[PDB]
């Protein structure tokens, strides 16, 4: 009777983000890597892999065009459907701007949508330094992805992060952490509830067919940890341009250890409701992380923003 939650990394960037999720852990989800790149699929620690297309490139540099990723996913739509069938929720992670993520992520999303599965995408846009062509590919793919998902969180790499000692691996680590934070913050309300369990219908109510979304998070310890974590999440760099009262939905995850108090649940809810609209749907849940002592995290997902 447990929830079935699948997290799909599409292409190299998305596969890299999901590999980070595997290393850092998200409780109770199943991880998949979808890629045209057969070598990436051999190397990945992600437990389930799905090859799309033949895995043989028919032209030098051809794999950078989103049409190749789209055509590859379309050729293997049966394998995508068979992997997704039976899920209660699917997350799609991609770095937009390449050929595979950009082109194949909207195909994966539509397969999930057509199966009736609540589908949330968490994707990045390329750094400005990657050039206008990749940015144009990324934005065109986000237009297409937005037609096939219930909620879309778009993280511009330019907003997150460059200087000495910061490698390319380090630069994408920041994006990986945000993508993980969004997937973890939503999924773990279902897979590892604390004293106030959210009901999945409430997750569906604030995420199904909602459109654009954005996440912020905060963490605090001490006597006032609950209000402080919530205030930090609302003031997070990703929510700075977003008024929470313009969000048709708000989903909130309070994560902490065994001591999470009902009065802390009430405090967080009071804080979030102070910022949210009365003409919206608000959902506050908790997750239990037995390894957390003192610390309390609040993750806020504003949905239906525009
Ligand atoms: N999080 C993360 N993002 C990456 C990584 N590498 C590249 N990106 C970003 O994701 C975008 C797409 O890059 P890739 O994923 O490698 O391209 P892809 O979708 O596999 O498609 P192709 O390589 O063209 O076949 C890039 O333009 C970068 O902005 C990575 O290792 N981790």
Residue numbers in the entry: 9 to 169, 172 to 316
From the paper:
The GTPase activity of FtsZ is largely dependent on polymerization, as the GTP-binding pocket at the ‘top’ of a subunit must make contact with the catalytic T7 loop residues at the bottom of an adjacent subunit in the protofilament to hydrolyze the bound GTP. Crystals were successfully obtained of the EcFtsZ(L178E)–GTP complex that were isomorphous with the EcFtsZ(L178E)–GDP crystals. In spite of evidence that the L178E mutation in EcFtsZ inhibits assembly, the crystals showed that EcFtsZ(L178E) assembled into straight protofilaments, as noted in the previous study of Du et al.. Presumably, as the residue corresponding to Leu178 in SaFtsZ is wedged into a hydrophobic pocket of an adjacent subunit in the SaFtsZ filament, the similar burial of the Glu178 side chain into the hydrophobic pocket in the EcFtsZ(L178E) filament is predicted to be unfavorable.
FtsZ, a bacterial homolog of tubulin, assembles onto a ring-like scaffold called the Z-ring, which serves as the foundation for cell division by the divisome. The N-terminal subdomain contains the binding site for GTP, and the C-terminal subdomain has, by analogy with tubulin protofilaments, key catalytic residues that contact the GTP in the subunit below to initiate GTP hydrolysis. Strikingly, although E. coli has provided the most detailed understanding of the machinery and mechanism of bacterial cell division, the structure of the E. coli FtsZ (EcFtsZ) protein has remained elusive.
